Design a protein around this ligand. Structure first.
Ligand code: RBF
Ligand code: RBF
Length: 375
């Protein structure tokens, strides 16, 4: 009866989805300076988030053994897991211990693994719950899910991450406590959304429903496995302004794509194929730039900064739009159709991360750049 309030509440509910991982990733530079691992930490966090897909195996087993039980119990378990994990991370992130003879960060990595589990279960737990609503709220859900990534980047901007050795404006404790506040707000918004709602076969093997799952898997394998790995190697040779602009504008291109989808939405499979193609084009240009990390073409000229920022903006916006559109097309099916859309996203992301591990952590194909020097 009150559509704007429902839009706001579903937006906040969706915002509290992937905030912990998207905050850890942006905070990595402040933490790296103290931990004994060094700059090998982004390859540990990646493997942890890839292994976190065991939350699906637990959600499925609980949905099997308890067949007709309630549907809001996994949502609340995931929310409490996230809140308590972020509090414990804010409290005990700097404890090291000798494992295998080497000093290692056990508390940081264990809590990152728990948060990855919660965030991976959040998909197959939160997304199918929107079958109780008209399809115009999937777009608000995804807009909030994009704000989930946009807000920590602004927080790291205010903190002063990446200023080059200056001392930030506040330590990592304040950052993780702000993340805890975000997660509590999301839990309260979902509790209100529960008060707002009234008291209570041939498709899976079709070609039209496989053409959408393949698109979801491929676009998510690109956006969630490869770009987080080649980001710095692509953007760093062009300075500190290029890197900051690329990061912030790529993070802000998701909510704007979801707003544009709120405006007009595509519904033909061929249009989504074309959009995915023009996104893969830029996604491949970025990696072709990252392979030549020492000296890419057009370095030190104002053309390269623009040509490397616009690629990130275009890629992330196009893929977010295709995700929103394909998910809204599969909503006609039910909770079963929506459940299929989360599993595909997660399988694609897992395949992307597993495929990106060997070029990055085994053979070292990309070569880093020494600061204040032009090789
Ligand atoms: C290392 C890493 C792995 C991620 N994996 C996923 C993922 O599997 N699925 C997902 O929806 N988002 C994942 N994200 C976040 C994804 O970009 C997220 O949808 C947007 O950040 C906010 O929606 C990941 C983010 C990072 C930094
Ligand atoms: C795997 C890896 C990731 C890196 N990530 C960043 C980064 O995110 N931001 C950055 O400024 N430098 C990054 N660097 C470069 C790092 O800052 C560089 O080694 C030091 O500046 C050299 O003193 C990275 C280097 C490596 C090897």
């Amino acid at each position: 009866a009150r559509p704007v309030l429902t839009h706001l509440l579903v937006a906040l509910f969706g915002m509290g989805s992937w905030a912990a991982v998207n905050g850890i990733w942006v905070e990595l530079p402040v933490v790296v300076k103290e931990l004994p691992e060094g700059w090998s930490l982004p390859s540990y966090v990646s493997v942890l988030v890839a292994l976190g897909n065991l939350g699906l195996l637990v959600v499925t087993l609980w949905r099997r053994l308890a067949p007709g039980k309630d549907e809001q119990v996994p949502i609340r378990v995931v929310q409490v897991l996230g809140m308590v994990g972020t509090a414990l991370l804010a409290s005990l992130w700097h404890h090291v211990a000798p494992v295998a003879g080497q000093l290692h960060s056990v508390a940081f990595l264990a809590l990152a693994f728990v948060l990855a589990l919660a965030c991976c279960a959040s998909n197959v737990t939160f997304l199918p719950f929107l079958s109780h609503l008209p399809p115009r709220f999937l777009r608000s859900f995804f807009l909030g899910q994009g704000l989930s990534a946009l807000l920590p980047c602004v927080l790291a901007l205010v903190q002063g991450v990446g200023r080059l050795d200056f001392l930030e404006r506040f330590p990592a404790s304040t950052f993780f406590w702000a993340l805890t506040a975000l997660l509590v707000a999301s839990a309260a918004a979902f509790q209100g959304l529960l008060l707002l709602l009234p008291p209570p076969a041939y498709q899976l093997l079709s070609a039209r429903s496989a053409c959408l799952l393949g698109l979801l898997a491929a676009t998510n394998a690109l956006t969630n496995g490869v770009l987080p790995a080649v980001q710095s190697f692509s953007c760093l040779p062009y300075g500190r302004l290029a890197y900051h602009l690329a990061v912030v504008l790529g993070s802000a291109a998701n909510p704007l794509a979801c707003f544009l989808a709120m405006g007009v939405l595509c519904r033909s499979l061929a249009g989504l194929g074309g959009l995915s193609l023009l996104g893969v084009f830029c996604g491949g240009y970025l990696m072709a730039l990252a392979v030549l990390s020492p000296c890419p073409p057009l370095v030190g000229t104002s053309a390269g900064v623009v040509l490397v920022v616009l690629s990130w903006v275009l890629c992330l916006g196009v893929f977010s739009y295709v995700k929103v559109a394909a998910s809204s097309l599969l909503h006609g099916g039910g909770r079963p159709a929506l459940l299929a859309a989360g599993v595909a996203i997660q399988v694609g992301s897992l395949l992307g991360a597993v495929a990106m591990f060997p070029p990055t952590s085994i053979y070292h194909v990309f070569h880093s750049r020494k600061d204040c020097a032009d090789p």
